[PDB]
Design a protein around this ligand. Structure first.
Ligand SMILES: *[C@@H]1[C@@H](O)[C@H]([C@H](O)COP(=O)(O)O)O[C@H]1O
Ligand SMILES: *[C@@H]1[C@@H](O)[C@H]([C@H](O)COP(=O)(O)O)O[C@H]1O
Lengths: 316, 316
């Protein structure tokens, strides 16, 4: 058989898309969305119903334009999640407004709001991951949310400091990036070609996986952001991998068996003291890639939130 | 006469160097040092005495190598400052260990330590600025230090969020950058030639000046980091400008009178509520230049601190 089937021996495959067609085709365990994917899925003609339903629902919650905008955008994201959950047996990841990324209290509130919308639609918390940026503030939000029974997907994870802080916070899942790290290295160094094992994103996630397993952390490691199938294959054995339909298709069309790459077979090591905020900030900012890309990914998801709001505002 | 004399009609000229020769030649009101300048000034043959004196003093404070390293490096910076104060009637800026930049409590302690060294040498606080990075943690450190009669120079100021937070903290002085902003724009955009008025660093400091004066803030605005004399001339009227000997020389050798560029002639405007940490983080991270350059400048100054420590460690 094919490399997607072979990968699935080792790794739980997750579909990184808001498109239900992919869920039907690849029958993934979980799915991930993000504000950009929500904005793109809103353009799928067959999703016009979901948009109109979100708007109609919002208009019934209040007579305030600003609030209708927020209600409609949140309901759209949730409506898309609900369609996906009809077709995937595991989790949907739904991302909070990235404008809240440096605000712990606002992020906790938004997570609870999205959870409420799902719960009111009949979906329990065991089917949802609230996805948010792994800034210090986001990690602290997640720590509290997990204590209150809300499982999170900590994302935009670039530096080891972020990885460590997320594990120490006991978050349900992390989605550390591969592809965006490659992007940075291609843009900021003269090496524009990497063998899969030397891809800096592959190295990053591999190192994270090892750290997590060597210290007995239970946080799920889900690689995210991919540019090529080689990156994915180098991470075979990662707990989960979230992969866009384009690369799911490439894997399914690639013949051959693959070997497991990521394993931990040793003893559990004693954990350090928790990283402090000051230590986290020092260490994250040692990493010029992580500095740039965390801030950038937040800015970009925030822009897409604003674009979604503009789309919705025009329909009220 | 010359452009340096002409500039001095409008702006207090400060010498950006650890080299006493410059203080004698240009007779500046104040001087600024930084960890890189301290490392460089340590290489001036005539400063060997200052180094040997710092090491000998350190060895008398303790028999602990780690502590001697810190004591000697701090004493060297102060010894250089003391030499400069013999030749300048105003302030010396002496910068704290940049490794402390994301640690408010450690930064407060270091500032007080340096102040103690100066005070023990007979120098009062009205002659000293403790220089530190304008991270949130540094601004909070400075806010407290000012309440305790220690005047600070908040530096590595790139974003407007930083400028606003520094003003709101009531810091004695800021040293926002011009030249490093130009550096970033040349490296990250296709425009590698700027007319002085369009130089993004000039624009940054000009905007900061306007904001400070329009809201009645008393914090001194001292432009820092220069790549050419045109940048400096565009800021004629800035409260202070700290300028390296190379450009002081260029200004002194340029004939011609210059006009004042930076002025505020209006009414005092009401201040907003204080920017919160979350707002500050959001706004700072909107600025990819500021994101990169704040973290980078900290990393670089920290490296120079380590290099200084290596030099000292070798002499114990
Ligand atoms: C959410 C998930 O949807 C995304 C995605 O995997 C990133 O992919 P690129 O945009 O291709 O880098 O990342 C998580 O934050
Ligand atoms: C301290 C001061 O010494 C420096 C200096 O002005 C920066 O100049 P470049 O190194 O040429 O950009 O800046 C303050 O932090």
């Amino acid at each position: 058989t094919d490399k997607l089937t072979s990968l699935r021996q080792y790794t739980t495959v997750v579909a990184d898309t808001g498109d239900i067609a992919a869920m039907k085709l690849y029958q993934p365990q979980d799915a991930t969305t993000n504000p950009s994917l929500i904005l793109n899925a809103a353009q799928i003609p067959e999703y016009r119903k979901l948009i109109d339903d979100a708007v109609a629902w919002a208009k019934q919650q209040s007579n305030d334009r600003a609030q209708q905008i927020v209600d409609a955008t949140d309901k759209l994201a949730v409506n898309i999640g609900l369609e996906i959950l009809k077709l995937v047996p595991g989790r949907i990841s739904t991302e909070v407004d990235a404008r809240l990324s440096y605000d712990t209290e606002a992020s906790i509130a938004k997570a609870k709001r999205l959870i409420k919308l799902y719960n009111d639609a009949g979906i329990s918390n065991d089917r949802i991951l609230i996805k948010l940026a792994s800034t210090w503030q986001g990690i602290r939000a997640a720590e509290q949310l997990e204590k209150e029974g809300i499982n999170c997907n900590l994302t935009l994870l670039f530096s080891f400091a972020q990885a460590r802080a997320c594990a120490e916070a006991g978050v349900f899942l992390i989605s550390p990036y591969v592809g965006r790290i490659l992007d940075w290295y291609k843009a900021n160094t003269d090496k524009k070609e990497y063998a899969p094992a030397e891809d800096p994103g592959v190295v990053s996630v591999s190192e994270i996986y090892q750290y997590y397993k060597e210290h007995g952390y239970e946080t799920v490691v889900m690689g995210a952001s991919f540019r090529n199938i080689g990156e994915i294959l180098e991470l075979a054995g990662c707990d989960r991998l979230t992969i866009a339909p384009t690369l799911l298709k490439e894997l399914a069309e690639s013949e051959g068996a693959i070997e497991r790459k990521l394993s931990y077979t040793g003893e559990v090591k004693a954990r350090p003291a928790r990283i402090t905020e000051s230590e986290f900030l020092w260490q994250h900012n040692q990493d010029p890639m992580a500095v740039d890309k965390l801030a950038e990914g937040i800015r970009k998801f925030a822009i897409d939130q604003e674009k979604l709001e503009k789309m919705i505002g025009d329909l009220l």
